[PDB]
Amino acid sequence: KIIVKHVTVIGGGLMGAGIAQVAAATGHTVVLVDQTEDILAKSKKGIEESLRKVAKKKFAENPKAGDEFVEKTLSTIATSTDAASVVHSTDLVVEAIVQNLKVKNELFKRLDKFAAEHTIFASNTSSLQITSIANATTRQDRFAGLHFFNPVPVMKLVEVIKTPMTSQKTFESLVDFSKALGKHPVSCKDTPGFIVNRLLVPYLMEAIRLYERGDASKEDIDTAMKLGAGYPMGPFELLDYVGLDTTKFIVDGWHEMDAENPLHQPSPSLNKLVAENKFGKKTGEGFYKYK
Amino acid sequence: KIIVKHVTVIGGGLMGAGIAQVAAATGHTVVLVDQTEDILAKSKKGIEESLRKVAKKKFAENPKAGDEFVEKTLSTIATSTDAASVVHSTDLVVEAIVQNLKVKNELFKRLDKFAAEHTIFASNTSSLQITSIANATTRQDRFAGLHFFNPVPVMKLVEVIKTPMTSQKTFESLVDFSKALGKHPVSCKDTPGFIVNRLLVPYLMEAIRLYERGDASKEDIDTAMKLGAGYPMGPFELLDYVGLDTTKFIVDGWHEMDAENPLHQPSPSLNKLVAENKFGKKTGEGFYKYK
Ligand SMILES: NC(=O)c1ccc[n+]([C@@H]2O[C@H](COP(=O)([O-])OP(=O)(O)OC[C@H]3O[C@@H](n4cnc5c(N)ncnc54)[C@H](O)[C@@H]3O)[C@@H](O)[C@H]2O)c1
Numbered sequence: 169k170i171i172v173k174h175v176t177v178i179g180g181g182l183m184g185a186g187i188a189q190v191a192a193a194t195g196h197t198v199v200l201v202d203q204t205e206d207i208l209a210k211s212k213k214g215i216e217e218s219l220r221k222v223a224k225k226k227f228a229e230n231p232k233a234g235d236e237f238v239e240k241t242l243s244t245i246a247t248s249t250d251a252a253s254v255v256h257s258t259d260l261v262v263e264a265i266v267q268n269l270k271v272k273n274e275l276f277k278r279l280d281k282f283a284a285e286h287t288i289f290a291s292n293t294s295s296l297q298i299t300s301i302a303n304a305t306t307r308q309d310r311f312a313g314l315h316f317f318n319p320v321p322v323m324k325l326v327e328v329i330k331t332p333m334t335s336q337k338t339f340e341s342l343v344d345f346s347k348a349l350g351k352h353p354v355s356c357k358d359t360p361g362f363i364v365n366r367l368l369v370p371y372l373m374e375a376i377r378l379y380e381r382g383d384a385s386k387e388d389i390d391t392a393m394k395l396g397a398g399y400p401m402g403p404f405e406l407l408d409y410v411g412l413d414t415t416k417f418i419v420d421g422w423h424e425m426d427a428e429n430p431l432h433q434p435s436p437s438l439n440k441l442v443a444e445n446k447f448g449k450k451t452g453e454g455f456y457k458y459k
Numbered sequence: 460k461i462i463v464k465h466v467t468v469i470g471g472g473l474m475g476a477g478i479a480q481v482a483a484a485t486g487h488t489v490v491l492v493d494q495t496e497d498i499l500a501k502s503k504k505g506i507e508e509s510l511r512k513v514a515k516k517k518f519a520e521n522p523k524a525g526d527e528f529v530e531k532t533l534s535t536i537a538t539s540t541d542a543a544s545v546v547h548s549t550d551l552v553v554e555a556i557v558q559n560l561k562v563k564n565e566l567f568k569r570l571d572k573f574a575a576e577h578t579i580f581a582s583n584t585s586s587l588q589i590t591s592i593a594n595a596t597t598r599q600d601r602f603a604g605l606h607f608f609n610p611v612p613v614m615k616l617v618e619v620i621k622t623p624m625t626s627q628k629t630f631e632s633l634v635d636f637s638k639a640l641g642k643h644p645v646s647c648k649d650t651p652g653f654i655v656n657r658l659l660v661p662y663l664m665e666a667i668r669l670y671e672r673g674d675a676s677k678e679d680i681d682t683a684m685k686l687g688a689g690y691p692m693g694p695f696e697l698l699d700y701v702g703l704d705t706t707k708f709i710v711d712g713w714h715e716m717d718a719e720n721p722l723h724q725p726s727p728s729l730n731k732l733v734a735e736n737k738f739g740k741k742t743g744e745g746f747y748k749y750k
């Protein structure tokens with residue numbers, strides 16, 4: 169049982185950068201990876217900005233401290249464009265790149281040849297079976313899902329996904345790692361949607377359908393779930409918040425592998441909006457318009 | 460323009476007593492109806508204790524005002540075992556009794572002939588279509604759903620259901636009444652589950668099925684939805700809170716009405732717990748053990 173000290177995060181987007189940020193802020197030695205240096209420098213700048221925002225709202229009584237915090241955490245975030253150059257000495261690889269099974273497998277297959285014997289491989293994906301990706305390597309015992317939620321620095325939850333091949337040693341390691349990041353880990357098999365998404369998304373789709381049916385208004389559905397269920401965000405504010413494109417993606421997928429399941433029939437409204445580039449808060453408009 | 464001032468509540472259970480308490484606590488004259496004097500004496504005793512509980516905090520700095528509040532509210536709640544005798548000149552009849560369609564229709568067909576012409580009829584039912592009960596009277600235009608949530612005096616939401624026969628005058632009357640109770644009304648057509656239950660129960664069942672499939676434990680699933688979706692209670696904690704038998708009854712109804720919808724497929728575990736009289740908190744045990 170080895171303790172994860174060096175993390176190699178692959179993906180400089182919202183998730184990857186967040187994962188990198190939290191790992192470094194909790195003492196882990198990180199190497200963020202992306203295709204260009206501009207992508208990387210820009211991703212790291214976002215980390216700094218986010219971290220400084222944290223600093224002020226924690227070290228407001230001694231900026232001198234907040235500065236050390238931010239530079240210390242930032243310094244342990246090395247960067248590289250070819251992950252193959254650092255996996256030979258890394259303890260864990262957390263992938264958070266484009267949802268393309270082929271590209272992911274090509275990545276992990278090559279990474280398999282460079283990685284150390286102990287090195288563990290994890291994917292933060294939400295629309296692919298960890299198993300499909302793990303079979304690109306001959307490291308299945310050290311392969312598993314490590315699912316975070318945006319905004320990673322804030323969401324306390326982390327789903328540790330166990331394939332039929334994940335060893336018990338790999339599992340305890342990521343569980344331990346999850347606690348080391350200050351997050352709370354849960355267990356789930358390699359089933360579509362895992363826990364959260366499997367229970368959130370189908371619900372988000374139902375709300376949409378109740379609206380399309382004209383049974384009630386969006387504003388009302390949102391009020392109904394917030395007040396009658398105590399949810400932080402109404403379903404339509406949540407859809408716009410997590411992305412309409414992101415949502416449609418996971419659902420088209422589920423629908424694809426089970427065309428007959430009613431829980432995944434596509435929504436004309438969600439499609440139209442998505443075809444119109446109205447992805448929610450990201451694009452300033454989804455089911456609602458924004459500032 | 461009908462302004463609801465005199466309200467007749469039929470049913471002194473958890474929902475009934477709660478609806479009467481709030482109505483009376485917000486300046487409306489109330490007549491609570493039930494089958495026997497003891498029932499009534501107990502319902503009114505609970506209302507009095509709930510109010511005291513509040514008044515002992517709310518008026519800590521004003522004991523006198525606190526008593527006046529409790530007495531005035533209490534004395535604005537009359538009791539009776541003869542509904543027909545009360546609705547002679549009432550403005551609103553809110554029904555919250557045993558979930559038997561046959562019994563509700565009889566009660567309403569009868570009340571319909573004694574109530575004043577302007578009296579609006581409403582049902583707080585969760586497992587019946589308002590249209591059905593409405594057609595037991597010849598006052599359908601004055602018949603609607605007025606759905607509250609336990610604990611009534613706390614939950615600020617109220618679903619105002621309008622059938623395709625309900626008048627706008629009626630709808631608006633109940634919307635103003637809702638605000639008068641200090642609640643926040645939302646509109647939904649007469650469709651099974653309306654909004655909250657229609658979007659919450661099937662989710663709760665999906666949580667149960669995920670567990671029945673063995674994909675994840677109840678504990679992790681609840682932790683997952685709380686930390687990952689910010690929900691106040693995990694689906695299992697919530698299931699024990701709302702009543703496994705209550706939950707079950709609704710789902711069955713939907714299953715009977717739609718025997719082929721997979722969202723209403725019975726849950727072996729849910730049926731077992733009910734069969735073993737483990738309904739949740741109101742038993743000390745359901746999916747979990749309490750106190
Ligand atoms: N958006 C969410 O809240 C959320 C939650 C869970 C999971 N996910 C999934 O996690 C992934 C992370 O998404 P994101 O929002 O950060 O997106 P993003 O587009 O901002 O970041 C992805 C990054 O992957 C890089 N990349 C692509 N191919 C690469 C390769 N071969 N080598 C190195 N880098 C490569 C891209 O240049 C890009 O910067 C997505 O696939 C997404 O579906 C998203």
Ligand SMILES: NC(=O)c1ccc[n+]([C@@H]2O[C@H](COP(=O)([O-])OP(=O)(O)OC[C@H]3O[C@@H](n4cnc5c(N)ncnc54)[C@H](O)[C@@H]3O)[C@@H](O)[C@H]2O)c1
Binds near residue numbers: 475562586607
């Ligand atoms: N229990 C819940 O959490 C919950 C949540 C939502 C909706 N509901 C619905 O709300 C209504 C209220 O349920 P409750 O929890 O207070 O139940 P309850 O069984 O505690 O109360 C019902 C009351 O109705 C009385 N009653 C029955 N038939 C009657 C009749 N013909 N005339 C007069 N009184 C009669 C009973 O004596 C009893 O006091 C029901 O229709 C129920 O399906 C229940």
